[PDB]
Amino acid sequence: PIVQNLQGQMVHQAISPRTLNAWVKVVEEKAFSPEVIPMFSALSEGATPQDLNTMLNTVGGHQAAMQMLKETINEEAAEWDRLHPVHMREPRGSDIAGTTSTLQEQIGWMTHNPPIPVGEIYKRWIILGLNKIVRMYSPTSILDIRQGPKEPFRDYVDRFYKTLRAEQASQEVKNWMTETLLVQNANPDCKTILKALGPGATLEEMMTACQGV
Amino acid sequence: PIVQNLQGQMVHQAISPRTLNAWVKVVEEKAFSPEVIPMFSALSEGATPQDLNTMLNTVGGHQAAMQMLKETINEEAAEWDRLHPVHMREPRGSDIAGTTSTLQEQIGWMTHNPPIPVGEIYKRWIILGLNKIVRMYSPTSILDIRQGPKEPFRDYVDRFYKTLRAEQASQEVKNWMTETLLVQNANPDCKTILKALGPGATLEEMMTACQGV
Amino acid sequence: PIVQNLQGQMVHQAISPRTLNAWVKVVEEKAFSPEVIPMFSALSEGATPQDLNTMLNTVGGHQAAMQMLKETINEEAAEWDRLHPVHMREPRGSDIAGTTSTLQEQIGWMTHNPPIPVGEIYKRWIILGLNKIVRMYSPTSILDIRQGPKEPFRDYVDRFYKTLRAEQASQEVKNWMTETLLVQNANPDCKTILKALGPGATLEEMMTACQGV
Amino acid sequence: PIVQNLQGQMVHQAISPRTLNAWVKVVEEKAFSPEVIPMFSALSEGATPQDLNTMLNTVGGHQAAMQMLKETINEEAAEWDRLHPVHMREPRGSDIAGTTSTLQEQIGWMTHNPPIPVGEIYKRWIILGLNKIVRMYSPTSILDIRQGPKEPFRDYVDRFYKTLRAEQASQEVKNWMTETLLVQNANPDCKTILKALGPGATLEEMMTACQGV
Amino acid sequence: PIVQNLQGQMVHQAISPRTLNAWVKVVEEKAFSPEVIPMFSALSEGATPQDLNTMLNTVGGHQAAMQMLKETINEEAAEWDRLHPVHMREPRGSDIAGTTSTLQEQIGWMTHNPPIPVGEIYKRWIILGLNKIVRMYSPTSILDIRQGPKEPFRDYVDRFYKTLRAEQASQEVKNWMTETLLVQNANPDCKTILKALGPGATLEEMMTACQGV
Amino acid sequence: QGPKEPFRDYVDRFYKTLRAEQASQEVKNWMTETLLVQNANPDCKTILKALGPGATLEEMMTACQGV
Amino acid sequence: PKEPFRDYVDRFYKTLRAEQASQEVKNWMTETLLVQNANPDCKTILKALGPGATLEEMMTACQGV
Amino acid sequence: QGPKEPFRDYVDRFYKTLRAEQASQEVKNWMTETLLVQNANPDCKTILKALGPGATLEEMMTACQGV
Amino acid sequence: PKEPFRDYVDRFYKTLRAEQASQEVKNWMTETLLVQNANPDCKTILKALGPGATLEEMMTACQGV
Amino acid sequence: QGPKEPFRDYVDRFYKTLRAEQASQEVKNWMTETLLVQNANPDCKTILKALGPGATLEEMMTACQGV
Amino acid sequence: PKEPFRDYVDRFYKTLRAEQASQEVKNWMTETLLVQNANPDCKTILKALGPGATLEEMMTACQGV
Amino acid sequence: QGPKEPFRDYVDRFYKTLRAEQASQEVKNWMTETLLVQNANPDCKTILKALGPGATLEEMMTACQGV
Amino acid sequence: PKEPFRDYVDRFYKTLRAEQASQEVKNWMTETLLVQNANPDCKTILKALGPGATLEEMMTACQGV
Amino acid sequence: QGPKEPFRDYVDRFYKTLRAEQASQEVKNWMTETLLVQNANPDCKTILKALGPGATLEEMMTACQGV
Amino acid sequence: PKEPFRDYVDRFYKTLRAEQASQEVKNWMTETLLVQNANPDCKTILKALGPGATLEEMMTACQGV
Numbered sequence A, B, C, D, E: 001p002i003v004q005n006l007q008g009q010m011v012h013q014a015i016s017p018r019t020l021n022a023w024v025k026v027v028e029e030k031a032f033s034p035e036v037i038p039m040f041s042a043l044s045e046g047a048t049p050q051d052l053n054t055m056l057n058t059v060g061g062h063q064a065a066m067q068m069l070k071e072t073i074n075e076e077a078a079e080w081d082r083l084h085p086v087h088m089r090e091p092r093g094s095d096i097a098g099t100t101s102t103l104q105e106q107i108g109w110m111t112h113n114p115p116i117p118v119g120e121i122y123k124r125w126i127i128l129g130l131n132k133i134v135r136m137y138s139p140t141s142i143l144d145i146r147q148g149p150k151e152p153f154r155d156y157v158d159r160f161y162k163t164l165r166a167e168q169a170s171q172e173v174k175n176w177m178t179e180t181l182l183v184q185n186a187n188p189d190c191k192t193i194l195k196a197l198g199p200g201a202t203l204e205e206m207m208t209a210c211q212g213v
Numbered sequence F, H, J, L, N: 001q002g003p004k005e006p007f008r009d010y011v012d013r014f015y016k017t018l019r020a021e022q023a024s025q026e027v028k029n030w031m032t033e034t035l036l037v038q039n040a041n042p043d044c045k046t047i048l049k050a051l052g053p054g055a056t057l058e059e060m061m062t063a064c065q066g067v
Numbered sequence G, I, K, M, O: 001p002k003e004p005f006r007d008y009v010d011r012f013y014k015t016l017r018a019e020q021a022s023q024e025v026k027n028w029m030t031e032t033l034l035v036q037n038a039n040p041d042c043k044t045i046l047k048a049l050g051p052g053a054t055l056e057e058m059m060t061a062c063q064g065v
Helices: A017-028 A036-041 A049-056 A063-083 A103-111 A118-136 A153-166 A173-183 A188-195 A203-209 B017-029 B037-045 B049-056 B063-083 B102-112 B118-138 B153-166 B171-184 B188-196 B203-210 C015-030 C036-043 C049-054 C062-081 C103-113 C118-136 C154-167 C171-184 C188-194 C202-209 D018-028 D038-042 D049-056 D063-083 D102-111 D118-136 D153-166 D170-185 D188-196 D203-210 E017-029 E038-041 E047-058 E063-081 E103-109 E120-134 E153-166 E171-184 E188-194 E203-210 F008-020 F025-038 F040-053 F055-062 G005-018 G024-038 G040-047 G055-063 H007-020 H027-036 H043-050 H056-064 I006-017 I023-036 I038-045 I055-064 J007-020 J025-038 J042-049 J057-064 K003-017 K023-036 K040-047 K055-062 L005-019 L024-036 L040-050 L057-064 M005-018 M021-036 M040-047 M055-064 N007-020 N025-038 N042-051 N059-066 O005-019 O025-038 O040-047 O056-061
Strands: A002-004 A009-012 B002-004 B010-012 C002-004 C010-012 D002-004 D010-012 E001-003 E010-012
Touching: A002 A103, A009 A103, A017 A036, A017 A049, A017 B017, A017 D002, A017 E017, A036 A118, A036 B002, A036 B017, A049 A103, A049 A118, A063 A118, A063 E203, A103 A118, A103 K003, A118 E203, A153 A173, A153 A203, A173 A188, A173 A203, A173 J025, A188 A203, A188 F040, A203 B063, B002 B102, B002 H056, B010 B102, B017 B037, B017 B049, B017 C015, B037 B118, B037 C015, B049 B118, B049 C062, B063 B118, B102 B118, B153 B171, B153 B203, B171 B188, B171 B203, B171 E103, B171 F025, B171 H043, B188 B203, B188 E038, B188 H043, C002 C062, C002 C103, C010 C103, C015 C036, C015 C049, C036 C118, C036 D018, C049 C103, C049 C118, C062 C118, C103 C118, C154 C171, C154 C202, C171 C188, C171 C202, C171 H027, C188 C202, C188 L040, C202 D063, C202 D118, D002 D102, D018 D038, D018 E017, D038 D118, D038 E017, D049 D102, D049 H027, D063 D118, D102 D118, D102 N007, D153 D170, D153 D203, D170 D203, D188 D203, D203 E063, D203 E120, E001 E103, E001 N059, E010 E103, E010 O005, E017 E038, E017 E047, E038 E120, E047 E103, E047 E120, E063 E120, E153 E171, E153 E203, E171 E188, E171 E203, E171 O005, E188 E203, E188 J042, E203 O005, F025 F040, F025 H056, F040 F055, F055 H007, G005 G024, G024 G040, G024 G055, G024 K003, G040 G055, G055 M040, G055 N042, H007 H056, H027 H043, H043 H056, I006 I023, I006 I055, I023 I038, I038 I055, I055 K003, J007 J025, J007 J057, J025 J042, J042 J057, K003 K023, K003 K055, K023 K040, K023 K055, K040 K055, L005 L024, L005 L057, L024 L040, L040 L057, M005 M021, M005 M055, M021 M055, M040 M055, N007 N025, N007 N059, N025 N042, O005 O025, O005 O056, O025 O040, O025 O056, O040 O056
Parallel strands: none
Antiparallel strands: A002 A009, B002 B010, C002 C010, D002 D010, E001 E010
16 A cells, blocks of 8 residues: 655555455455455555555466466556557556556556556456456356245345356346346246336335245 | 544545455345444444445445445435535535545545534435345345244344344334234244233343243 | 553544444344453453443444343443542543543543543443343353263363353352352263262363263 | 554553454354464463453453463462562562563563563463363363274374374373374274384375375 | 664564464464465565564474474575575575574665565575475375366366365476366266367366356 | 135224224334235235335225235 | 137227227226226236226236236 | 142242252352242243242242142 | 133122122122132133232233133 | 257247347347357257357357257 | 277278379368268267368367267 | 273283383373273273372272272 | 161161270271171272271262162 | 286386377376376275385385285 | 294294305395295285395284284
8 A cells, every 4th residue: 555654755555464364365265256356356445556466476376367367467458558658657558567667656656646546557457357257267157047946035136146246247238137037037936926016126126025935 | 534644634544455355244245134234334433425435336236235325325415405505615415425525525524613524424324225225135024033933032032133123113113013023923832931921021021031941 | 442642642542443343243243142241341442431332332223232231331320429429520420431421531531640440440331231131142041051961071061151151140159050060960971970079179170080971 | 562652662552452352252262272372372472461461351251261370370470489589670470470560560571681571471371371271171182082984184183183282291292192193093094004104104204195095 | 574663764563463363373273275375475474584483483383284394494594505605694594594693684684775585585485384284284186186976167176276286296287287187087077068178278268168067 | 814815804804903903103004014915815915015015005905806 | 718818909909999989988998898808817917907007018917827 | 849749849848958958048049049940840930930030939839829 | 611701700790789898898809709719720820910910910811711 | 949959940949039039239149149058958058168159150050950 | 880980081091092083172072071971970079170170180079989 | 901801900911011112201101191091991990080190000909999 | 788878877886886896996997897898889889989988978979879 | 007907017008108198298207106106006006105206116016016 | 824924933033043054145045035935915015015124124014914
C-alpha cells in the first residue's frame, strides 16, 4: 500500500506478512473456487504493482494457473501498449505490470493529479486472469446443475449461482440463464411451483414461493 | 474510518485490506445466514460511505442480493430526500449513499458539531437491505420449525430463535411467536413440561425446566 | 480502549472493527458455551463502558439473553448506588454502565490517581450476566454427565469440567462435586481404578492412573 | 510488550485484546494438546510478567490445570530465591512472577544493560508448568501407540511423535524411544520394511522407505 | 522486520506475537503439507535472520524435521563460505544464519546500498530445508496417484499437482510428469477423453474437456 | 384444512376460530396472512402460494374454489 | 374430454366468428364460456387465472394439461 | 426414588441418608435442592420441576402426594 | 367417571347455588369439594395446583384430562 | 439427441428448434456453442468435445457422421 | 477384418509403389482410400481426423483399434 | 506377564532380560519404571497402578503376591 | 466364607478383648491375624494395603468385597 | 515385473523399453531411478527399497537374484 | 534343513578350526561357503547382505529365518 510519511510525502508500506498469509490461505485451501476473486480484490486494496507481484509469487507453484495468469497479464500489457502508444514518463504495459517500473514510479503515478492508478489498473488484469483460472477449475457446466429430488431450493439456488458466477457468460446470457435454467433444472415439484409464477418472476418471488417446498 | 492526523485535523483511514477480507468471508461463506447482519454492523464500525461502498462492491456478484440492496438504498435515499427537503451543504440521499458526495464532504459531515453521521446513517439503510436478503435466503418459515422427537430443547430453541431472527415480524409478533409457537412446536414430552409452566413463563424458566428432558 | 495521544494526554481509541467481528463470532457461533466468558473477558481488555456497550449491541438480537444481561446490569447498578451513596463527580451506577456518563467522564475516571476503573468494573457486571446466560444455555446438569462405557477418561473429565464450569455452584460445592461426582459418574472399570486412589486423590493422580484405561 | 515511546524512553504496551483472544482459543479449544506450548511461547513474545499474568488469568477456570501451574511457578520462584540470594533492586522470585514487582520494575529489569529478562525468564517457569499440564491431559502412553493394520506410516509417525512430545522423557530416552519403539510398534508389514534398514536408520530413511507401504 | 524510526534511521521491529502464532498454526496443524512453504515464505516477508530464527524455534520440537533443517542451513552456510571467501564486515555463513552476527549487522547489511539482503538470502536456505521436510512427510509417490473410478477430474488434478509440488523433480521432469503421468494415471473413461487431445494439450484443454466426465 | 375440505369451509373454520383468539390485532394481522396459507391443504396451498401474499381473501377463494 | 386445448380453442373461435351476438356478449362469451365449456381439468387450471385472462394467458397456462 | 415409591417415603429415605452424609452444610444445601428433584421418580420428578427450585419441601410433598 | 370437567363444574356450581350453607362454608366447599369429588384423574391433576387455585386455574389446568 | 440418432438429424432438430426460440442473438450464440455439444449423444458428444469449442458445424458433422 | 492397422498400411503402400497413377492421384489414393478400404472400426476412428491426416497421425490414432 | 504368571516370576523374567539389554542406565531407569507396570498382567497391573510410580519393587511385590 | 467383613471384625475384636496376650502381641494379632484369618477374597483385598493399615482403612477398603 | 519373473529379465525388459522411449536424458535419469524400483515385483521391490536410491544396478541385481 | 542358523554357524566354525587351508582360503571359505551351504531360506536372506557381510551381520540378519 501507500501511506503518508511523517514528512507528509507519500511512501510505500509493504503488504503486511499476515495479509500475505491470508492470501496464501485463499490460494492454497480454496482451490480457485469463485470466492478467490473477491478475496484477491479485497486483500489487494490499494496494492502497488510491486505488492501485487508479491501476491502473485504464491500463485507460482500452481504452475498451470500461473501460466494462464502470466499470459493474460502479458496479453493485457500488449493491449495497453496498443491502446496508449508512447507520447514521470507515462507507464508502458510492463510498467503497469511492475516489471520495468521503479517503486517510486508506481507511487508517483498512483499519487499524481489526476491519479494514474497503476495498482488498481493492474489488479484488473490479474482479476481477469483469475477469472480464466476459476473457469478452468470449475467442477461443472451450469447445464449440469440440477436440484436434488429432496434438495432445499435455497441450496440449489446457491449451487446454481455459484456455478453461474464461474461461467464465461455475458450479463445478457446470465440473465437468460437465471430465468430459464433456474426454472428448467429445478426438481419437478419445485419446478411446478416456479412455473406457476410466470416468466417475469424475481428471484425473491421464486425463493419465497419455494420456502419449505 | 476517520482518524486524527498528525496535524490534529481529522482525515480518512482506508478500511484495511484484511478487514475487507473478513467481510468477503462473511458474504461468501455464511450464505446470508442471519449473523451476516451483526458481522456487517461490526466490521463497518465508523465506516464512511466510501468505505461502506467499498464493502458492498463484494455483495456485487451475488447479483440478486445486490439488486435488492441497491433498490433498498435507493428507496431509503428517496425517503431521506422526502423527509429532509433542500434548505458544507446538507447531504442529499445520494450524498448519504456516497455516490454524489466527496470524501471530504462525508468526513466533514461526520466530524461536524453536532455530527451529521452520514456513515452510521447509511449503514442503517444497508442493514435494512441485508434484512431483506436474510429473509430471502432463510431456509424455513418459523412455522416449519418443530423440535425433533429426541432433540435437546436448547438445540430446538436455537433453531427457533435463529429462524425468528430472520423473520419480518414486528416485536409484538415476535413476542407472541416466542410464547405460543415455542411451546406449540416442542415435541409432546417437552411440550408437556413447558405447558406446566403456564403462559407467563420466561425463556429461562422454560430452558431450566427442560434441561435433560 | 484508552491511548496516550501525541500531546501525552490520554484519549479514546475505538474498539477496532475486526475485534468487534471476533466478538460477533464468539456470540453467534459458540452459542454461549462457557468459553464465551473468557473470550469476552479477553476481547474487552481495557474497554471503556462505551466500548463495552458497543460489544453488547451484538448480544442484542439474542433478545432473551440480552434481557437477562440488561436486568443483571440494572440490578448491579442499583447495588452500586446502594453500596456507594452520593457524596469529576463520582460515577453513579448508570455512569458505570455508560448510559448517563460522557466518554470523557469514563476516561477521566479510568485515568485518575488512584484509578476509578469504571470499565473493568462494568465488565464484572457484564461477566456476571454472561454467567447467568451460560447457565441458561447449558445442555445438562453436572449430575447428567456420565462416562461412556468406552469413553477415554480425559474426554469424560473434559465433559465434566466443561459442565461444572457452567454450574452455579460455589467453590466449596465445586470441590465436593469434583471429588465425589467425578469418581461416582465414571464407568465401572475406570471407577474401580479411581476408587483405589482413595478420597484425597488429585486430578493429576486420577488421570495419570486412568491413561489407557 | 515493551515499546519505545515518543520520548525514546521504553514504555509498556498492553498485550492487545485479540492476542488474548487467540490465547483463549488455544486454551479452550485445543484441550492442552502439545501445540499449546508452542502457541503460548509464540503469543507471549516479549511479554512482561504483568502480561504473562494477564494470559494466565484465562488458565484460571481450568482450576486443576491452574493449580498445577501456580504450584510450579511457586516452586520455581523458591528455587530462584535459593539460587540467587539477596545481595533497581534485584528481583526476588515473586518479582519475577510479577506479583510483588511494579510494572516499572519489570520494564526496568528487561531494559537494563545487561538485560535482566524477567519476562522471558518467567515464561520458562510457565512453560514448565504447561509441560506438566500437557502430560496430565495426554490421552496415551507412548507405549500405547501402535500403527493401524492399514495406517499410513506418516500418520503413525505423527501419532507417535505427537505422543512423544508430551512425554516426560529426557532427550536420551526420547532417542532410544524413537529408534526402538517406532520400529517395534509399527504393523508387521511396515515393521518388516523398517527392520531391513538396520539400527542406524534416520527418520528420513524410515519414511522414504515406507512411502506407499 | 525493519522499520524507519522517528529519527528516519532504520530500526528493528520484532515479528509480532500473533504472526508467530500464525506460523505455529502452520507448523503444528498442517503437518508439513506443501502449503507450509508458501505460508513460511509469506509470514517471513522482510524477516531479519533474528526473526527467522525466532520462527525456527518452533520447528524445534519436530526434532527430526528440525535436524534436517539445521543440517541444510549448515550445508548452505558452508557453501556460502566457499562461494564467497573472506575479503560492516562481509557476512560469513554463520552471519547470514544470524548465529554469529549482531542484529545491527543484519539490519546494516539489509539496508546497505546495494543491499546485502541477508534475511531474504537466509530465507532461501530455510525454504530449501522445508522442501526436504515436505518430501519426507509426503504421503505418496507421484506414481501412486491414480484417479478414482468416479473421481472428478479436477479433484484428481489437485491430488496429482499437490503431490507433484512435493516431489524432488526438476522442472524438465515435472513437465514430462505432467503430460505423460496425468494422462497415464487417469481412469479409463477420462483417460480416453484425455488421449483424444493428443500430446500437446494444455491443462486448460484437458480440464475443459473433462468437465462433467 | 382437511384432506378433501372445500376452501370456503376452511376459511370459515379459520376466521371463526380467529374471532375467539385473544391475541392483539397486530398478531391477528400476521395470523391472517401467514397461517391461512401455511395450514391450507397441499393442493390448495400450492394454488394460494402462487397468488403471493398481497392477494385478498376474495381472490384466494376465487382461485381455490373447486381445487 | 381429452381434446388438446388449442384445438378446443380453435373450434370455439371458429364458431364465435359465425354466431352473431353483440360485442359485449362476445367478450363475455370468450371470457366465461371458453372456460366453462373447457375440459374439467382445463377448466380447473383456467379458473386459477381469474376473470382477467387473455387467450394468450389461457393457452400458455393450460398447455393441454 | 423407586418406580412406585410414595414421595413421602423417598423424602424420608433421602433426609435419613443426608443426616449420615459427612459433607459440609454448604454442600448439603446444594444436595437438598438439586438431588431431591434429580433422583425423584420420572412422574414425580415431572411434578417437582414444574414447582421450580424455590419451592419448600412442604409444597413438594403437597404436590406429589398421590402421583 | 369420564365426564368432561366443565360439565362436572357446571353441575357442582348449579347445586352450590341451591344448597344454603354460609359463605365461609361455600368457599371451603368450592376449594376442597370441587377437587375431592372430581374424577380420580382430574383430582390428581387439580391437587398439583395446591389450595390457592381459582376455578379459572382449575379449568385451564384440567382441560378434561 | 436420440440414443441411435444420426448427428445430421439431431442438428436439424436443434436448429429447427432454435429458429422458434425467442431469446436474443447473444443468447442464441451461447446456445449454439454450448447446448449442441452438451445435449449430443454420449458417443457423439465424446467426438465433439475432442474438436474443442472453436470447431465449425461443418467440422462437427464431418467428424460425427457414422459414429 | 481384424488385421492390425500397420499391416494393412504396409500392404497398401507396398501396392501403391507398384500401381502407376500420377502424383495427384496417388495423394488422393492415400488420403481417401487408406481410410475407405480400412476395417470398419479403423475407418470410423480415422474419419475423426478429417481429410488433413498424415500417415503418422493415422497410425498413432488407430493403434489397431 | 503371563495370564496366570506369579508377579515374582514376571519380575525375574523382566530383570533377567534387562541385564542383557544394551541401552544406557538412563534408558534402563525409564524402562524399570514404565515397562514393568505397562507389561504386567491386567489384574496385577491394576494393583500396581494404584501404588503410583514412586513405589519400590519390594512394595510392588508385597502388593501383588497372590493376586 | 461369605461373612460380611464388619461382622468378622466384630467377632475378632470381641475375642481379642478376652484373650490375654501382652500389648505387643495384641498389636501383631490385629495386624497379621485380622488379615490372615479373613475370607480369601477379603484377605486378597486387605494385603493390597500393606502392613501399615489401621482398622478404618481395612473396613473402608474391604466393604465386604 | 511379472509375478514370478527373474529380476534380470525384468531389468532387460525395462532398459530395452527405455532405449525406445523418446524423453530427454534428464527424464530417463529420473525414470531409471524411480520406475525400476516402483514397478518391481512386491518381493523384489521390498529387497530393492532396502538398498536405498543410491544403489547401482549391479548391486540391485546382486541383491535380487533368486528372490 | 531347519537347523537354527547359530547352530549351523557353530558347526561350520568348529570345522573351520580343524581343516587346514591357508588364510586367504579361510577368508573365502567363511564368506562364500557359510552362505552357500546355509539352508535355502537362510541363504536367500544372507545374499541380501552382499559379499561384505561379517558374521555378526549374518547372524543379526538371519535370526534363524
